[PDB]
Design a binder for this molecule. Structure first.
Ligand SMILES: CCCCCCCCCCCCCCCCCC(=O)OC[C@H](CO[C@@H]1O[C@H](CO[C@H]2O[C@H](CO)[C@H](O)[C@H](O)[C@H]2O)[C@H](O)[C@H](O)[C@H]1O)OC(=O)CCCCCCCCCCCCCCCCC
Ligand code: CLA
Ligand code: CLA
Ligand code: CLA
Ligand code: CLA
Ligand code: CLA
Ligand code: CLA
Ligand SMILES: CC1=C(/C=C/C(C)=C/C=C/C(C)=C/C=C/C=C(C)/C=C/C=C(C)/C=C/C2=C(C)CCCC2(C)C)C(C)(C)CCC1
Ligand SMILES: CC1=C(/C=C/C(C)=C/C=C/C(C)=C/C=C/C=C(C)/C=C/C=C(C)/C=C/C2=C(C)CCCC2(C)C)C(C)(C)CCC1
Ligand SMILES: CC1=C(/C=C/C(C)=C/C=C/C(C)=C/C=C/C=C(C)/C=C/C=C(C)/C=C/C2=C(C)CCCC2(C)C)C(C)(C)CCC1
Ligand SMILES: CCCCCCCS[C@@H]1O[C@H](CO)[C@@H](O)[C@H](O)[C@H]1O
Ligand SMILES: CCCCCCCS[C@@H]1O[C@H](CO)[C@@H](O)[C@H](O)[C@H]1O
Ligand code: OEX
Ligand SMILES: [Cl-]
Ligand SMILES: [Cl-]
Ligand SMILES: [Fe+2]
Lengths: 451, 334, 342, 79, 137, 30, 33
């Protein structure tokens, strides 16, 4: 029981895992066992989704979050997102599930049987948190791994069947990406885009060529950065800027994950390219835009001239201008005029929505998709009654978009806290006052009084 | 040393009457800009077309408001989430019409209050303190982010962010209940538990310590004179307090460890208010309170109402009246 | 000690797991009956005959929706005793008429008296100043104003809060729509006391925990405290400097700080009670007359205060027919206030 | 104070002998209270078929104070 | 009150013939109506066209009359506008446009009868609340 | 007169803030 | 150690109805309209 109590380790049970900070072998165990839980969930959750799955109902009516992820990679789906074959869904779940037993094995072994520390046994695998060179080297290894991970996406997209392309001319379909975007002016341009409306920073990426080119860039950058970090030690300005400790490296990672969680929340909420509405359901903006399109269609069928119909406020009931003049849908959805979607773009001309096209060119499939998206807006209750908050029970629906946004906002938020907690604790422990104020060297007692 | 090293020494000085610090260097100007804009707008701004339907709502005192009805009104629904700084407008006249002051206030305020939180970490480091006061502050700060930024983002518009005024805040609450049934949301319920509990334990702790002050003063002088700033001895008897409280309820329902007791005082309202913030930030994406509308059915299929259904009837009243000229189509989807 | 009284006193004050005292003869049966009345009603009892509502687990309700509901408006402010002229000793009828409501309200009222006596009694025996009892007057003023005064000013107990989670929410929304209770400055002081109390709680607990002295070796710092130790476990000096430099002002006197922690939320709840006494009489803070005159004469004048009254009028029209069934409200569709489309 | 610690009591074989019988007997007694329908008649709660008569369009609301008991009785007779 | 054989007896055709549904068909009808229809017709209304509801009286004045099993079954095969002038299979789910309304692909004739049965029975239970919308919640 | 009164009370509070901070009773460690 | 104490009565005035009620509510989960 080598330091598995509070007396020996100085950490209570509820801070139990802090006991692992300088026990590299047991800590590797914690980490491998953990990845096992992650890979486990992925495989079992996939299988559960597949067992519950009725191919003829939209994914988004079935509470699915993982199958949609698989389908977007182009597996199991065809034109319009029609499921042609569930076996890839099956393969993905099984292989994760089996793999998790292997990780679980490794994890349990290192946690409970192998050497508690790895430094005596091996210098390659051993490490000291304060060894700035080892730390950048491990980091460097994982950067190379991550880089290859990005290149696997590219490989799928260009050489192994392509990706689901909601924008595919003629309708959504799987499509091979042959000409990915390589121009750094485009790829790095996205990073300098404003995060506000009508801009959306990286969340705006609206074609697979950009998505593929971006991953080409990232795979290269990450492998390059990995090599760099294996070959180098930190410059002195970096040495002087950071806390160098297990708890501090955790805190930096916590900050970056919180940030990524937040980005992920906005991605799934707004983006319908890498989260195709065919699989994930319509975005909030999209559903709101679909309602105005639905009634524009209905009312014009009834004889309404939609261009000159003045609403109660004096703005056009169906159509109006954005603050920069573009023709856009009216009523509340004015806010959503930045929305772009494949069922809608055919009506858009250079000035925004085109009245000639609206009067003549609205196809039945557009009416159909707008009705569908209007009635699958991402609104529902925690007990999964779909609808507005005043809706009666009947429809069992919460959009996959709401589940993915809400969960990840919560996760990103607590990770930010985790970051503040650990950053502040790491700072204090590095300076030596994390356990409290020395009663005989109280800093404030040595300072001039304020007034 | 050099001019820069002197500057750094001053910024980070533990001796300034108000700590400045690196977070302070961002906090001071942003908070001043927000404060100044807020005060001027609250007194003098013209009416703002909050819902982008050319229906300007008067927020300021000079345009017919009092302290209670007054507000800095959210920016126009026609703007949505577009960034609307002063230089994006053709004139200040236009800027004021469209609610530009609101974006200026809430953006400088959020940056400033985030730095206010960083500054709290910073000073505690300069003073050799443990670092988590800033974490307690993350709870109100998260709540402010929920109503001024996250909610607008989810709903596609700053016109749905909380208005910067008293009656405005109530408007936001009421529309929120209609659209999300926030009362039936368990994160809001944890929030209530958090603030009701926070009040309770405050009244409790205050009262337990006070009841236990050691006799140090005359029958005429304030008991506060019994405690001197900086004294080393503890001014009340915690064993007597525990003797009382442990008997009020039962022994183990009571704290004799001041440290775990003060921990519980920090944790209870902070965690509950985190859930409140997260309630608002997750209803931002339309995951709403429990819906038990028509949940009880009789043998024939007659709906038997519950108190959930009477809640529904009140929510419906709010729904159909709110923004009475803004909807043209039958469903309110944001 | 002498006579039977003193012997009984001995027994009542024995140092046991659950103190009893004289206050216990009041406290314990009334707290237990109020609570078991609540659990019994929410588990098995309907509200069909009083409200047209299901309200128990037996009928299909869940934890958020069960309640012990108020009696029917036709009952007035009847005590509704089991043996009263309404139920006439019939237990089933009593349950059906709302008898559990007054049962829980009155036993709860006497239980609360008992608890506060228990606070005076324990403090007297331990030899402390009875500040805790005094602080508890705030919960008392709230219970009495809201559960007793309010419905006593209104037409009947029907309009008191019903004992249930969703029922209490309904109570909230009724107060907004009918009384515009958010506008009321006594409710606003209540909010300040409750949110200020919660702030004071968070901020004091966090300040102590972050200016602790190192009195141990453990990285978990809870063990480095001794109940009988002479010294402060944290530095008031550092805490004071920290807040002075952060916020501009700080406490310097620990007795003040704690007294203030009693004062703020207690005073808050007392203020809300006064407003609720006002609402017993429909003496609302409903309107600002100057806004109404301007708005009546100027159809382009709009404020958040006008916007919220349109919400209230929506709430009244839409909830009243099912919420006040004894009024037999029939509001044909054409009369209902509604904005465009919705 | 005095009483035996809970820790002692609930780890003692004698505790489990007594309560392996009393806990389930109470639970089952609770269950029967509902399954026999006994709960409905003690408390006067309607079963799913007893809220409304077959063609009734309105709620049996009590509207009389001193003969409300008799009204419920009347309301109960026509079901 | 109970879900009795009388409540479950509904017009089969335009000529006055009735059919008594079993409790099982009713439940089936409610289930399948949720599965395929309630996203637009929750409560007897129509989200995407509120002028048209599923009230019996409304159905009776459609062309052809839809206030009976046969009429509803035929609607579900080959839906028309309310005056019967136009075939709207391309934008309203039916057996005819099961290619584009995929939830229609495994509805059997018996399923269609069950849904028709649900639509005719609900207003007999719910009255004006069926097709009433939020006023009646 | 009404706006003036509101702004005047407000301004008195802001001034009261400045004195409470900068011209407080100094805390004395004795 | 005694067995029948105040603590003992207090515990059972609560624990006894509680289990009885839990069985009652468990049975309710199987009621259908
Ligand atoms: C190191 C850290 C230091 C930080 C320093 C501060 C730097 C400034 C940060 C800016 C803050 C962002 C505010 C605006 C956020 C927003 O409106 O975000 C939205 C954008 C998405 O923008 C949307 O992007 C969309 C992209 O979709 C478009 O393109 C799509 C392609 O398929 C579709 O076609 C879609 O229909 C189409 O409209 C559109 O442009 C929308 O108009 C546009 O609104 O998300 C994004 O940019 C992603 C990034 C935003 C992060 C989320 C904010 C959370 C903040 C933390 C809160 C917690 C704090 C707690 C404290 C305790
Ligand atoms: C992802 C969750 C996770 C993981 C991976 C770990 C991992 C670890 N913990 Mg932490 N811990 C956790 C969560 C976790 N913990 C939580 C939630 C708490 C609060 C309750 C703690 C509180 C805590 C304390 C107080 C301590 C640890 C310690 C440890 C380490 C030693 C364990 C030991 O000695 O057990 C001995 C236990 C057993 C022999 C029982 C069996 C345990 C095995 C691993 C169960 C495996 C079952 C699994 C289904 C097998 C699959 C097999 C198949 C693949 C073939 C180990 C690396 C200890 C420490 O740090 O040591 C230096 C320590 O003192 N933990
Ligand atoms: C990224 C996380 C994530 C997301 C977005 C989803 C989303 C979804 N799931 Mg998957 N799932 C997850 C993780 C997730 N789940 C995990 C970890 C498990 C294993 C337990 C599952 C196992 C699972 C099953 C078995 C099922 C789903 C189903 C569903 C759907 C309905 C969910 C529901 O009704 O919740 C109801 C809501 C809750 C239970 C409330 C969650 C509240 C948490 C506990 C609050 C705590 C917050 C924070 C984490 C705590 C911090 C504390 C603080 C003090 C520090 C929805 C599409 C259902 C389905 O439709 O499948 C097709 C279904 O049957 N899930
Ligand atoms: C990244 C996690 C990780 C790391 C850093 C280590 C590191 C270590 N392990 Mg542990 N272990 C892991 C995970 C890990 N292991 C897993 C998943 C299992 C179950 C299979 C084990 C089971 C295990 C046992 C039973 C033992 C070790 C031992 C060792 C030591 C020597 C290993 C060696 O020299 O091989 C050199 C390299 C090779 C032999 C070739 C490796 C071939 C790999 C598997 C293929 C390439 C993998 C590729 C990158 C894809 C990975 C999958 C990924 C996508 C998830 C060293 C401390 C030994 C020990 O600690 O000594 C006392 C020992 O007995 N490991
Ligand atoms: C997980 C990924 C990761 C991590 C944790 C690190 C960590 C580290 N890197 Mg390495 N690096 C990586 C990936 C990574 N690197 C990759 C992929 C490359 C190839 C491009 C590099 C190439 C590289 C170089 C060339 C150098 C490092 C250096 C360092 C060290 C200090 C870095 C620092 O202070 O930045 C913090 C950032 C700054 C100091 C810049 C100023 C801050 C700006 C204003 C922030 C703006 C961002 C803002 C939030 C907005 C985000 C979006 C934006 C794009 C608009 C540290 C060991 C240094 C070193 O010590 O090398 C040995 C160094 O010189 N790295
Ligand atoms: C401290 C204990 C306590 C207190 C203060 C109360 C108080 C109350 N109970 Mg509760 N109750 C208790 C314990 C208590 N109960 C216990 C242990 C049980 C289980 C048996 C009950 C079961 C119960 C039921 C079933 C009901 C109440 C009700 C009531 C209310 C009316 C009582 C009344 O009118 O009495 C009148 C009697 C007295 C006040 C006693 C007078 C004592 C004086 C000092 C002496 C006079 C004696 C007299 C002269 C001699 C006989 C007269 C003869 C000459 C004709 C009131 C809130 C009713 C209620 O809640 O309705 C909504 C109701 O229906 N109780
Ligand atoms: C929360 C309520 C509460 C509390 C905590 C106290 C506390 C105190 N009272 Mg005050 N008191 C109260 C309410 C309260 N009082 C009320 C409502 C009155 C009536 C006006 C009084 C009248 C009073 C006097 C005249 C005196 C005190 C005094 C005292 C002190 C000693 C204890 C005592 O005498 O209790 C008295 C006991 C109680 C308040 C509990 C009474 C329990 C009753 C009898 C139960 C009745 C059951 C009922 C008949 C059921 C029928 C219900 C019906 C609706 C159907 C202490 C400061 C004495 C003092 O100040 O010493 C210096 C003192 O002289 N009390
Ligand atoms: C360390 C530690 C811990 C943790 C641990 C862990 C975390 C572990 C993990 C583990 C794991 C992670 C495990 C896993 C496993 C797995 C498995 C075992 C699997 C298998 C599979 C199978 C067998 C399959 C089958 C199938 C198929 C093939 C097909 C389909 C169907 C089915 C599914 C049937 C704790 C906290 C306790 C504490 C103490 C210490
Ligand atoms: C994939 C993709 C793409 C691309 C992408 C990219 C290209 C990215 C990049 C990215 C990047 C490139 C990023 C960066 C980041 C960074 C950061 C995040 C930073 C941070 C920093 C820090 C944190 C610092 C800190 C500090 C300070 C500030 C001061 C002093 C101290 C210290 C050092 C602490 C696109 C969109 C095209 C399309 C889609 C897909
Ligand atoms: C009224 C009345 C009376 C009385 C009665 C009584 C006294 C009763 C009691 C009763 C009772 C005394 C009952 C109990 C119950 C209980 C229950 C029913 C429970 C439940 C619980 C649960 C369900 C749990 C939950 C939870 C929580 C709370 C948190 C943690 C987690 C969980 C979720 C587990 C007399 C005869 C005098 C006369 C006439 C009237
Ligand atoms: C560990 C990763 C092993 C992945 C196995 C490669 C499957 S690659 C394979 O390639 C085809 C086109 O060539 C696609 O049409 C097909 O969907 C895809 O699965
Ligand atoms: C029922 C509670 C009322 C208690 C107050 C009345 C006390 S009365 C008191 O009691 C003595 C014994 O202690 C007797 O010896 C004595 O004769 C009698 O006057
Ligand atoms: O803006 Mn403010 O309030 Ca959110 O919901 Mn839609 O939009 Mn408007 O109505 Mn309801
Ligand atoms: Cl409004
Ligand atoms: Cl609209
Ligand atoms: Fe304290």
């Amino acid at each position: 029981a080598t330091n598995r109590d509070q007396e020996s380790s100085g950490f209570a049970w509820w801070a139990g895992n802090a006991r692992l900070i300088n026990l590299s072998g047991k800590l590797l165990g914690a980490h491998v066992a953990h990845a096992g839980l992650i890979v486990f969930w992925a495989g079992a959750m996939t299988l559960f989704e597949l067992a519950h799955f009725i191919p003829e109902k939209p994914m988004y009516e079935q509470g699915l979050i993982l199958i949609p992820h698989i389908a977007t990679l182009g597996w199991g789906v065809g034109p319009g997102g029609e499921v042609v074959d569930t076996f890839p869904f099956f393969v993905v779940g099984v292989v994760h599930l089996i793999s998790s037993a292997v990780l679980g094995f490794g994890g349990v072994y290192h946690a409970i049987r192998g050497p508690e520390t790895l430094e005596e046994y091996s210098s390659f695998f051993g490490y000291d948190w304060k060894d700035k060179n080892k730390m950048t080297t491990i980091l460097g290894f994982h950067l190379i791994v991550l880089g290859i991970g990005a290149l696997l996406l590219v490989a799928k997209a260009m050489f192994f069947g392509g990706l689901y392309d909601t924008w595919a001319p003629g309708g959504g379909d799987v499509r091979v990406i042959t000409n990915p975007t390589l121009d750094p002016r485009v790829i790095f341009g996205y990073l300098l885009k404003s995060p506000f409306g009508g801009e959306g920073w990286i969340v705006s990426v609206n074609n697979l060529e950009d998505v593929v080119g971006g991953h080409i860039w990232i795979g290269l950058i990450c492998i390059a950065g990995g090599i760099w970090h294996i070959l180098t030690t930190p410059f002195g300005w970096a040495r002087r800027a950071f806390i160098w400790s297990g708890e501090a490296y955790l805190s930096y990672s916590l900050g970056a994950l919180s940030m990524m969680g937040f980005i992920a929340t906005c991605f799934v909420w707004f983006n319908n390219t890498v989260y195709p509405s065919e699989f994930y359901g319509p975005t909030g903006p999209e559903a709101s835009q679909a309602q105005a399109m639905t009634f524009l269609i209905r009312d014009q069928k009834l004889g309404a001239n939609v261009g000159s119909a003045q609403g109660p406020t004096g703005l056009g009931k169906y159509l109006m201008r954005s603050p920069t003049g573009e023709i856009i849908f009216g009523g509340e959805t004015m806010r959503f005029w930045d929305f772009r979607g494949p069922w809608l773009e055919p009506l858009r001309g250079p000035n925004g929505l085109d009245l000639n096209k609206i009067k003549n060119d609205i196809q039945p499939w557009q009416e159909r998709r707008a009705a569908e998206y209007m009635t699958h807006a991402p609104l529902g209750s925690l007990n999964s009654v779909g609808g507005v908050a005043t809706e009666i029970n009947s429809v069992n629906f919460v959009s996959p978009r709401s589940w993915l946004a809400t969960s990840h906002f919560v996760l990103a938020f607590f990770f930010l806290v985790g970051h503040l907690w650990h950053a502040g604790r790491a700072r204090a422990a590095a300076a030596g006052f994390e356990k409290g104020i020395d009663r005989e060297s109280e800093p404030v007692l040595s300072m001039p009084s304020l007034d | 040393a050099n001019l820069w090293e002197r500057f750094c020494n001053w910024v980070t000085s533990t001796d300034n009457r108000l700590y400045v610090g690196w977070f302070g260097v961002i906090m001071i100007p942003t908070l001043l800009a927000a404060t100044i804009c807020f005060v001027i707008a609250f007194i003098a701004a013209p009416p703002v077309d909050i819902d982008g339907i050319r229906e300007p709502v008067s927020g300021s005192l000079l345009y017919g408001n009092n302290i209670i009805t007054g507000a800095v009104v959210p920016s126009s629904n026609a703007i949505g989430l577009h960034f609307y700084p002063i230089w994006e407008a053709a004139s200040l006249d236009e800027w004021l019409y469209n609610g530009g002051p609101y974006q200026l206030i809430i953006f400088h305020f959020l940056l400033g209050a985030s730095c206010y939180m960083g500054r709290q970490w910073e000073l505690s480091y300069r003073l050799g303190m443990r670092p988590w006061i800033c974490v307690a502050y993350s709870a109100p700060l998260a709540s402010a982010f929920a109503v001024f930024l996250i909610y607008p983002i989810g709903q596609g518009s700053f016109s749905d962010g909380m208005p910067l005024g008293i009656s405005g805040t109530f408007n936001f609450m009421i529309v929120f209940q209609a659209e999300h049934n926030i009362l039936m949301h368990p994160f809001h319920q944890l929030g209530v538990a958090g603030v009701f509990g926070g009040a309770l334990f405050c009244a409790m702790h205050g009262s337990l310590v006070t009841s236990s002050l050691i006799r140090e003063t005359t029958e005429t002088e304030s008991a506060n004179y019994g405690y001197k700033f900086g004294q080393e001895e503890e001014t009340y008897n915690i064993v007597a307090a525990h003797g009382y409280f442990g008997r009020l309820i039962f022994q183990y329902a009571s704290f004799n460890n001041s440290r775990s007791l003060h921990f519980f005082l920090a944790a209870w309202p902070v965690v509950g208010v985190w859930f409140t913030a997260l309630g608002i930030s997750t209803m931002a994406f339309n995951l709403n309170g429990f819906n038990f509308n028509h949940s009880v059915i009789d043998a024939k299929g007659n709906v038997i109402n519950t108190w959930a259904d009477i809640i529904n009837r009140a929510n419906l009243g709010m729904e159909v009246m709110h923004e009475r000229n803004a909807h043209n189509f039958p469903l309110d989807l944001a | 000690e002498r006579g039977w009284f003193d012997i009984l006193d001995d027994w009542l004050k024995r140092d046991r797991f659950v103190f009893v005292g004289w206050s216990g003869i009041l406290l314990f049966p009334c707290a237990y009956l109020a609570l078991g009345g609540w659990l019994t009603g929410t588990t098995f009892v309907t509200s069909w005959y009083t409200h047209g509502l299901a309200s128990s687990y037996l009928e299909g309700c869940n934890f958020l929706t069960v309640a012990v509901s108020t009696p029917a408006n036709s009952m007035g402010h009847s005590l509704l005793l089991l043996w009263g002229p309404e139920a006439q000793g019939d237990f089933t009828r009593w349950c059906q008429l709302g008898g559990l409501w007054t049962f829980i309200a009155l036993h709860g009222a006497f239980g609360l008296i008992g608890f506060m006596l228990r606070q005076f009694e324990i403090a007297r025996l331990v030899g402390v100043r009875p500040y805790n009892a005094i602080a508890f007057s705030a919960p008392i003023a709230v219970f009495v104003s809201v559960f007793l005064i309010y419905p006593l000013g209104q037409s009947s107990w029907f309009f008191a809060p019903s004992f249930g989670v969703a029922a209490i929410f309904r109570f909230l929304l009724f107060f907004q729509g009918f009384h515009n209770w958010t506008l009321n400055p006594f409710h606003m002081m209540g909010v300040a006391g409750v949110l200020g109390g919660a702030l004071l709680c968070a901020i004091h607990g966090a300040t102590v925990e972050n200016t602790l002295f190192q009195d141990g070796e453990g990285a978990s710092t809870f063990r480095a405290f001794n109940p009988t130790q002479a010294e402060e476990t944290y530095s008031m000096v550092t805490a004071n400097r920290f807040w002075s430099q952060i916020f501009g002002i700080a406490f310097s006197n620990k007795r003040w700080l704690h007294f203030f922690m009693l004062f703020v939320p207690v005073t808050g709840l007392w203020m809300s009670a006064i407003g609720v006494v006002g609402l017993a009489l429909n003496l609302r803070s409903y309107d600002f007359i100057s806004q109404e005159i301007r708005a009546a004469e100027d159809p382009e004048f709009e404020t958040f205060y006008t916007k919220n009254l349109l919400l209230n009028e929506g709430i009244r029209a839409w909830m009243a027919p099912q919420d006040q069934p004894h009024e037999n409200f029939v509001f044909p569709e054409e009369v209902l206030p509604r904005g465009n489309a919705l | 104070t005095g009483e035996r610690p809970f820790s002692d009591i609930i780890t003692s074989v004698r505790y489990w002998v007594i309560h392996s019988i009393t806990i389930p007997a109470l639970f089952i007694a609770g269950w029967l209270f509902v399954s026999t329908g006994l709960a409905y008649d003690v408390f006067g709660t309607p079963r799913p078929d007893s809220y409304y008569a077959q063609e009734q369009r309105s709620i049996p609301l009590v509207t009389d104070r001193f003969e409300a008991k008799q009204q419920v009785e009347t309301f109960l007779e026509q079901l | 009150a109970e879900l009795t054989p009388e409540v479950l007896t509904v017009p089969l055709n335009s000529e006055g013939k009735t059919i008594t549904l079993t409790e099982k068909q009713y439940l089936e009808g409610k289930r399948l109506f949720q599965y395929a229809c309630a996203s637009c017709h929750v409560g007897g209304i129509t989200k995407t066209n509120p002028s048209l509801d599923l009230r019996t009286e409304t159905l009776a004045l459609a062309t052809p009359p839809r206030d009976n099993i046969e009429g509803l079954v035929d609607y579900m095969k080959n839906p028309t506008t309310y005056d019967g002038e136009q075939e709207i299979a391309e934008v309203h789910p039916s057996l005819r446009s099961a290619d584009i309304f995929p939830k229609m692909r495994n509805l059997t004739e018996k399923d269609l009868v069950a849904i028709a049965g649900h639509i005719l029975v609900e207003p007999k239970i719910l009255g004006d609340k069926w097709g009433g919308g939020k006023v009646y919640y | 007169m009404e706006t003036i009164t509101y702004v005047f009370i407000f301004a008195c509070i802001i001034a009261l803030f400045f004195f409470a901070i900068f011209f407080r009773e100094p805390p004395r460690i004795t | 150690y005694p067995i029948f104490t105040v603590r003992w009565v207090a515990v059972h005035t609560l624990a006894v109805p509680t289990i009885f009620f839990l069985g009652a509510i468990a049975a309710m989960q199987f009621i259908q309209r």
